[PDB]
Amino acid sequence: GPVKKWECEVISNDNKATFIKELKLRIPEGEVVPFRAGGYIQIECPPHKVAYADFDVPDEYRSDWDKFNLFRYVSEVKEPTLRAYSMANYPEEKGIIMLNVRIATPPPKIPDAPPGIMSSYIWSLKPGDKVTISGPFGEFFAKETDAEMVFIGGGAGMAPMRSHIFDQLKRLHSTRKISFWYGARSLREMFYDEEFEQLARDNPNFTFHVALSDPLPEDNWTGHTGFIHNVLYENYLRDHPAPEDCEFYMCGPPVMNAAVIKMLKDLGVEDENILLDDF
Numbered sequence: 001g002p003v004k005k006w007e008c009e010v011i012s013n014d015n016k017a018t019f020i021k022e023l024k025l026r027i028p029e030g031e032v033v034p035f036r037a038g039g040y041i042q043i044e045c046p047p048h049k050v051a052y053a054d055f056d057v058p059d060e061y062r063s064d065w066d067k068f069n070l071f072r073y074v075s076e077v078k079e080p081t082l083r084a085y086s087m088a089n090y091p092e093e094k095g096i097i098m099l100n101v102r103i104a105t106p107p108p109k110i111p112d113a114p115p116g117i118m119s120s121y122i123w124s125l126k127p128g129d130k131v132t133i134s135g136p137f138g139e140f141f142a143k144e145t146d147a148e149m150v151f152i153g154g155g156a157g158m159a160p161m162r163s164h165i166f167d168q169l170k171r172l173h174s175t176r177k178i179s180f181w182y183g184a185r186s187l188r189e190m191f192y193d194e195e196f197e198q199l200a201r202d203n204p205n206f207t208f209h210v211a212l213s214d215p216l217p218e219d220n221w222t223g224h225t226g227f228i229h230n231v232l233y234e235n236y237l238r239d240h241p242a243p244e245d246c247e248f249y250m251c252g253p254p255v256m257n258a259a260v261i262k263m264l265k266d267l268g269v270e271d272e273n274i275l276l277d278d279f
């Protein structure tokens with residue numbers, strides 16, 4: 001039972017945030033990748049050498065790239081490798097595989113480490129390039145109950161978050177109470193917000209909340225500030241009659257995963273009601 005593979009063509013590879021690209025791949029026509037919301041594929045790369053200076057980083061994000069001297073990096077790979085990336089589209093969005101891919105730069109305290117192999121390769125891709133994906137795979141699946149669902153996301157965790165939420169509202173036509181809580185550093189780091197706002201207008205049972213930890217003055221931000229674990233508690237769980245009866249679905253950067261799960265455990269939520277997708 002060898003894993004299925006598809007050679008896909010790159011449609012677009014646009015920044016959605018300073019350090020996240022939306023890689024959109026065209027599935028070969030007439031074919032289906034039979035994935036589930038929350039699932040993922042693997043991408044492979046050939047041997048290559050790519051310069052960060054050749055990345056298509058748009059106007060709104062170049063100042064930070066220049067500030068951290070990121071355009072100097074080069075990534076050289078002599079052997080093919082594989083990495084997993086989660087679908088941001090949901091299964092009824094046919095014909096494409098949408099990914100959200102964080103650029104895995106060298107650590108700040110070890111800035112001369114090799115850049116991340118597969119994310120650097122992905123960020124080098126241009127429309128018309130070909131990439132081979134394999135799978136699909138999955139473990140981060142929704143529980144099918146009537147319980148309230150609480151989705152918490154950060155960074156590239158937006159991908160399974162979007163997949164899950166669209167799957168509930170558009171394919172399952174779910175009437176369950178569903179809320180999505182997304183933490184980001186500032187306004188330019190938020191994406192897909194218009195989609196979720198439209199979903200909230202069309203689905204009374206769905207609500208969407210963004211917390212910005214470090215909003216810029218020019219963001220003109222009057223929404224919630226701080227970290228998403230505190231915003232979720234202070235603006236919702238603190239007067240929820242029974243948070244323990246909720247299903248929590250977590251996917252963010254490690255610091256956010258830990259802080260949210262600690263908050264939930266401190267509320268008495270049982271491990272069985274907390275599902276984590278750790279990238």
Ligand SMILES: Cc1cc2nc3c(=O)[nH]c(=O)nc-3n(C[C@H](O)[C@H](O)[C@H](O)COP(=O)(O)OP(=O)(O)OC[C@H]3O[C@@H](n4cnc5c(N)ncnc54)[C@H](O)[C@@H]3O)c2cc1C
Nearest residue numbers: 084085086101102104105106113115116117118119156279
């Ligand atoms: C099921 C699953 C789903 C995932 N979904 C997503 C997703 O949707 N989006 C996403 O962006 N990621 C996702 N990930 C993570 C993804 O698979 C990769 O791990 C990620 O892209 C980084 O891989 P890389 O090849 O770019 O970096 P790697 O080459 O694996 O390097 C990782 C980090 O280590 C650093 N490093 C390397 N060598 C050294 C050294 N000597 N000293 C110090 N530091 C060093 C690199 O600079 C880099 O920051 C997922 C992972 C899993 C398991």
Ligand SMILES: Cc1ccccc1NC(=S)NCc1ccco1
Nearest residue numbers: 183184185213227253255256259
């Ligand atoms: C990681 C991250 C990404 C985007 C926006 C904010 C954050 N920071 C977080 S979630 N910090 C958690 C926290 C606060 C105190 C202890 O842990």
